[PDB]
Amino acid sequence: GSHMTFVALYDYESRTETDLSFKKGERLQIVGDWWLARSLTTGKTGYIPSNYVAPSD
Numbered sequence: 001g002s003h004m005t006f007v008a009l010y011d012y013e014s015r016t017e018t019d020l021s022f023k024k025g026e027r028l029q030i031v032g033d034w035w036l037a038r039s040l041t042t043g044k045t046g047y048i049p050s051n052y053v054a055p056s057d
């Protein structure tokens with residue numbers, strides 16, 4: 001109901017073909033430890049480390 005939107009607590013740089021870079025404060029919508037997410041800044045989709053993000057509006 002709102003547990004699928006998150007905000008980045010730390011910067012993250014992509015390592016592979018499937019992960020998603022993001023900056024601290026960037027909001028992510030979620031589509032385990034790695035979550036498929038869409039950046040609400042760039043609209044790009046990829047996997048993010050779930051411990052790098054926290055619930056957000």
Ligand SMILES: COC[C@H]1O[C@@H]2O[C@H]3[C@H](O)[C@@H](OC)[C@@H](O[C@H]4[C@H](O)[C@@H](O)[C@@H](O[C@H]5[C@H](O)[C@@H](O)[C@@H](O[C@H]6[C@H](OC)[C@@H](O)[C@@H](O[C@H]7[C@H](OC)[C@@H](OC)[C@@H](O[C@H]8[C@H](O)[C@@H](OC)[C@@H](O[C@H]1[C@H](O)[C@H]2OC)O[C@@H]8CO)O[C@@H]7CO)O[C@@H]6CO)O[C@@H]5CO)O[C@@H]4CO)O[C@@H]3CO
Nearest residue numbers: 021022026027028029037038039040041042043044045046
């Ligand atoms: C230019 O104005 C036209 C547009 O204006 C209004 O849109 C606003 C929008 O409401 C507003 O949102 C709050 C903001 O948008 C931001 C997005 O919300 C945010 O997610 C991000 O956007 C991302 C996307 O998520 C990514 O997908 C990507 O987009 C690029 C596309 O990659 C998939 C790429 O293909 C290319 O898009 C083309 C598009 O092809 C898919 C093509 O479609 C025909 C054409 O788009 C038309 C569109 O059809 C038409 O729709 C009615 C209209 O759109 C207006 C919205 O309706 C209006 O809403 C209020 O005109 C478009 C332009 O002619 O052209 C596209 C551009 O080439 O390029 C995409 C851009 O790279 O990356 C983006 C950016 O990160 O950021 C958005 C803001 O940058 O702003 C919008 C206006 O800029």
Ligand code: NI
Nearest residue numbers: 001002003004
């Ligand atoms: Ni929810």
